[PDB]
Amino acid sequence: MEAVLYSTFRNHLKDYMKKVNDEFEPLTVVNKNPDEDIVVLSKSEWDSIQETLRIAQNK
Amino acid sequence: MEAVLYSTFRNHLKDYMKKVNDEFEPLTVVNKNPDEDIVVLSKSEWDSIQETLRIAQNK
């Protein structure tokens, strides 16, 4: 997964939001404090994951 | 899921990163352009999802 330093993510926030949407690929934001670290993905991909999970549970 | 306007998310980025970590709960960032919309969650929770998916496929 693409990994992005916090400062770089903050400095280019809209670009990264467009990237995860346009690429259907998540990224990780890297902090010096690991308890701040996050994953960013499009709502479309998140919904894909959640719909797939519920469909798979039904099947 | 908690929904956060883009401007509010940008203005309080570190607070929201700490929130998704401390709460083990994702949030959605709401843009005027839906193709910019994202989900933010902790790396810990993402890893939980991915480990669970692979374990469930094995079982």
Structure tokens at B8: 């509010």
Give the three-state DSSP class for B41. Answer: strand
Residue of B8, B33, B38 to mutate when probing chain A, most A C-beta within 10 A = B38
- B18 near A36, Cβ under 8 Å? yes
Answer yes or no: are the C-beta atoms of B6 and B36 closer than 8 Å. yes
Touching B: A residues 12-51, CB under 8 Å: 13-14, 17-18, 20-22, 26, 28-29, 31, 34-43, 45-46, 49
CATH architecture assignment, domain B2-58? 3-Layer(aba) Sandwich (3.40)
Write down the residue that tokens 């401007």 correspond to: B7
Q: What is the resolution of this structure in A?
A: 1.4
Beta-ladder partners of A5: A30
Q: Are B29 and B4 in contact (CB under 8 A)?
A: yes
Other C-beta atoms closer than 10 Å to the C-beta of B34 total 11
Determination technique used: X-ray
Give A30 to chain B, closest Cα distance, Å.
Answer: 10
Query: Taking CA atoms, what residue in B is nearest to A50?
Result: B49
Closest-CA residue to B18 (of A25, A29, A27): A29
DSSP A25: -
- Which of these, B22, B27, B49, lies nearest to A36 by C-alpha position? B22
Q: Say whether A49 sits in a helix, a strand or coil.
A: helix
Query: Within a 10 A sphere around the Cβ of B6, how many other Cβ atoms?
Result: 18
Spans of all domains in chain A: 2-58
d(Cα A57, Cα A53) in Å, to the nearest integer?
6
Do residues A11 and A4 touch, judged by C-beta distance below 8 A?
A: no
